[PDB]
């Protein structure tokens, strides 16, 4: 679907900045967690789709914040998440259960 239309914006950005970006889909928090440990240990960017939520993992906040924009251009109605440590993963998954999900809106971003 629209994940294939966003993939171009991400894989072009990998050539612009010289970092490794890759896109994958998951069904459960228990399966997805295993992918975050690899990305953070290796200093790499993963863009993950789980149950309609976009979870962005990177050791570079400037890579996440540009990916979030490129995701939200193509799906302005989709919810999003960000991770830079294995502690951030638990922080955001705890917020997912509590309803404290991301508030990325262009009138709030400025």
PDB file of C-alpha atoms in Angstrom:
ATOM      1  CA  UNK A   1       0.000   0.000   0.000  1.00  0.00           C
ATOM      2  CA  UNK A   2       1.168   3.577   0.837  1.00  0.00           C
ATOM      3  CA  UNK A   3       4.215   2.059   2.652  1.00  0.00           C
ATOM      4  CA  UNK A   4       5.674   1.419  -0.875  1.00  0.00           C
ATOM      5  CA  UNK A   5       5.034   5.114  -1.791  1.00  0.00           C
ATOM      6  CA  UNK A   6       6.827   6.279   1.420  1.00  0.00           C
ATOM      7  CA  UNK A   7       9.740   3.768   0.890  1.00  0.00           C
ATOM      8  CA  UNK A   8      11.148   5.959  -1.966  1.00  0.00           C
ATOM      9  CA  UNK A   9      11.406   9.030   0.363  1.00  0.00           C
ATOM     10  CA  UNK A  10      13.320   6.922   2.939  1.00  0.00           C
ATOM     11  CA  UNK A  11      15.640   5.043   0.509  1.00  0.00           C
ATOM     12  CA  UNK A  12      16.499   8.323  -1.342  1.00  0.00           C
ATOM     13  CA  UNK A  13      17.365   9.833   2.113  1.00  0.00           C
ATOM     14  CA  UNK A  14      19.784   6.902   2.686  1.00  0.00           C
ATOM     15  CA  UNK A  15      21.747   8.107  -0.440  1.00  0.00           C
ATOM     16  CA  UNK A  16      21.497  11.810   0.658  1.00  0.00           C
ATOM     17  CA  UNK A  17      22.995  11.252   4.169  1.00  0.00           C
ATOM     18  CA  UNK A  18      24.942   7.965   3.564  1.00  0.00           C
ATOM     19  CA  UNK A  19      23.180   5.977   6.409  1.00  0.00           C
ATOM     20  CA  UNK A  20      21.470   2.539   6.197  1.00  0.00           C
ATOM     21  CA  UNK A  21      17.621   2.865   6.269  1.00  0.00           C
ATOM     22  CA  UNK A  22      15.320  -0.222   5.855  1.00  0.00           C
ATOM     23  CA  UNK A  23      11.490  -0.729   6.024  1.00  0.00           C
ATOM     24  CA  UNK A  24       9.680  -3.790   7.598  1.00  0.00           C
ATOM     25  CA  UNK A  25       6.162  -4.828   8.857  1.00  0.00           C
ATOM     26  CA  UNK A  26       5.343  -6.614  12.201  1.00  0.00           C
ATOM     27  CA  UNK A  27       2.226  -8.027  14.008  1.00  0.00           C
ATOM     28  CA  UNK A  28       3.184  -8.014  17.780  1.00  0.00           C
ATOM     29  CA  UNK A  29       5.235  -5.936  20.332  1.00  0.00           C
ATOM     30  CA  UNK A  30       7.031  -9.228  21.274  1.00  0.00           C
ATOM     31  CA  UNK A  31       8.289  -9.803  17.679  1.00  0.00           C
ATOM     32  CA  UNK A  32       9.041  -6.120  16.938  1.00  0.00           C
ATOM     33  CA  UNK A  33      11.245  -5.581  20.064  1.00  0.00           C
ATOM     34  CA  UNK A  34      13.866  -8.048  18.655  1.00  0.00           C
ATOM     35  CA  UNK A  35      14.358  -5.825  15.557  1.00  0.00           C
ATOM     36  CA  UNK A  36      15.018  -2.681  17.684  1.00  0.00           C
ATOM     37  CA  UNK A  37      17.995  -4.287  19.542  1.00  0.00           C
ATOM     38  CA  UNK A  38      19.751  -5.012  16.194  1.00  0.00           C
ATOM     39  CA  UNK A  39      19.195  -1.470  14.811  1.00  0.00           C
ATOM     40  CA  UNK A  40      20.453   0.289  17.988  1.00  0.00           C
ATOM     41  CA  UNK A  41      23.472  -2.068  18.505  1.00  0.00           C
ATOM     42  CA  UNK A  42      24.582  -1.544  14.833  1.00  0.00           C
ATOM     43  CA  UNK A  43      23.882   2.266  14.689  1.00  0.00           C
ATOM     44  CA  UNK A  44      21.228   1.760  11.919  1.00  0.00           C
ATOM     45  CA  UNK A  45      17.788   3.160  11.008  1.00  0.00           C
ATOM     46  CA  UNK A  46      14.684   0.921  10.836  1.00  0.00           C
ATOM     47  CA  UNK A  47      11.231   2.122   9.755  1.00  0.00           C
ATOM     48  CA  UNK A  48       8.643  -0.274  11.133  1.00  0.00           C
ATOM     49  CA  UNK A  49       4.889  -0.686  10.497  1.00  0.00           C
ATOM     50  CA  UNK A  50       2.926  -2.428  13.298  1.00  0.00           C
ATOM     51  CA  UNK A  51      -0.903  -2.673  13.346  1.00  0.00           C
ATOM     52  CA  UNK A  52      -1.154   0.631  11.351  1.00  0.00           C
ATOM     53  CA  UNK A  53       1.390   2.530  13.603  1.00  0.00           C
ATOM     54  CA  UNK A  54       4.757   3.744  12.202  1.00  0.00           C
ATOM     55  CA  UNK A  55       7.615   3.031  14.704  1.00  0.00           C
ATOM     56  CA  UNK A  56      10.912   4.761  13.720  1.00  0.00           C
ATOM     57  CA  UNK A  57      14.180   3.431  15.268  1.00  0.00           C
ATOM     58  CA  UNK A  58      17.545   5.241  14.823  1.00  0.00           C
ATOM     59  CA  UNK A  59      20.608   6.372  16.839  1.00  0.00           C
ATOM     60  CA  UNK A  60      20.250   9.781  15.016  1.00  0.00           C
ATOM     61  CA  UNK A  61      17.280  12.050  16.009  1.00  0.00           C
ATOM     62  CA  UNK A  62      17.786  14.098  12.780  1.00  0.00           C
ATOM     63  CA  UNK A  63      17.084  10.858  10.814  1.00  0.00           C
ATOM     64  CA  UNK A  64      13.857  10.122  12.782  1.00  0.00           C
ATOM     65  CA  UNK A  65      12.508  13.734  12.604  1.00  0.00           C
ATOM     66  CA  UNK A  66      12.913  13.856   8.779  1.00  0.00           C
ATOM     67  CA  UNK A  67      11.371  10.335   8.376  1.00  0.00           C
ATOM     68  CA  UNK A  68       8.358  11.401  10.555  1.00  0.00           C
ATOM     69  CA  UNK A  69       7.737  14.335   8.160  1.00  0.00           C
ATOM     70  CA  UNK A  70       7.980  12.065   5.042  1.00  0.00           C
ATOM     71  CA  UNK A  71       5.619   9.446   6.629  1.00  0.00           C
ATOM     72  CA  UNK A  72       3.126  12.188   7.652  1.00  0.00           C
ATOM     73  CA  UNK A  73       3.153  13.855   4.182  1.00  0.00           C
ATOM     74  CA  UNK A  74       1.839  10.555   2.704  1.00  0.00           C
ATOM     75  CA  UNK A  75      -0.421   9.578   5.675  1.00  0.00           C
ATOM     76  CA  UNK A  76      -1.402  12.766   7.672  1.00  0.00           C
ATOM     77  CA  UNK A  77      -4.012  10.640   9.585  1.00  0.00           C
ATOM     78  CA  UNK A  78      -1.515   7.892  10.768  1.00  0.00           C
ATOM     79  CA  UNK A  79      -0.036   7.614  14.290  1.00  0.00           C
ATOM     80  CA  UNK A  80       3.739   7.503  14.808  1.00  0.00           C
ATOM     81  CA  UNK A  81       6.392   6.471  17.395  1.00  0.00           C
ATOM     82  CA  UNK A  82      10.166   7.137  17.883  1.00  0.00           C
ATOM     83  CA  UNK A  83      12.999   5.145  19.570  1.00  0.00           C
ATOM     84  CA  UNK A  84      16.774   5.861  20.111  1.00  0.00           C
ATOM     85  CA  UNK A  85      17.501   3.567  23.127  1.00  0.00           C
ATOM     86  CA  UNK A  86      15.999   0.239  24.322  1.00  0.00           C
ATOM     87  CA  UNK A  87      14.667   2.367  27.263  1.00  0.00           C
ATOM     88  CA  UNK A  88      12.733   4.637  24.784  1.00  0.00           C
ATOM     89  CA  UNK A  89      11.035   1.470  23.380  1.00  0.00           C
ATOM     90  CA  UNK A  90       9.598   0.601  26.845  1.00  0.00           C
ATOM     91  CA  UNK A  91       8.714   4.321  27.456  1.00  0.00           C
ATOM     92  CA  UNK A  92       6.625   4.526  24.217  1.00  0.00           C
ATOM     93  CA  UNK A  93       5.039   1.022  24.589  1.00  0.00           C
ATOM     94  CA  UNK A  94       3.917   2.051  28.148  1.00  0.00           C
ATOM     95  CA  UNK A  95       2.364   5.231  26.598  1.00  0.00           C
ATOM     96  CA  UNK A  96       0.636   3.137  23.847  1.00  0.00           C
ATOM     97  CA  UNK A  97      -1.267   1.220  26.630  1.00  0.00           C
ATOM     98  CA  UNK A  98      -2.097   4.542  28.459  1.00  0.00           C
ATOM     99  CA  UNK A  99      -3.311   6.466  25.318  1.00  0.00           C
ATOM    100  CA  UNK A 100      -0.336   8.967  25.436  1.00  0.00           C
ATOM    101  CA  UNK A 101       0.439   8.513  21.681  1.00  0.00           C
ATOM    102  CA  UNK A 102       2.355  11.082  19.497  1.00  0.00           C
ATOM    103  CA  UNK A 103       0.873  14.597  18.847  1.00  0.00           C
ATOM    104  CA  UNK A 104       2.606  15.345  15.493  1.00  0.00           C
ATOM    105  CA  UNK A 105       0.466  18.168  13.970  1.00  0.00           C
ATOM    106  CA  UNK A 106       1.887  20.974  11.736  1.00  0.00           C
ATOM    107  CA  UNK A 107       0.166  23.709  13.873  1.00  0.00           C
ATOM    108  CA  UNK A 108       1.805  22.174  17.052  1.00  0.00           C
ATOM    109  CA  UNK A 109       5.263  21.480  15.435  1.00  0.00           C
ATOM    110  CA  UNK A 110       5.956  25.285  15.057  1.00  0.00           C
TER     111      UNK A 110
END
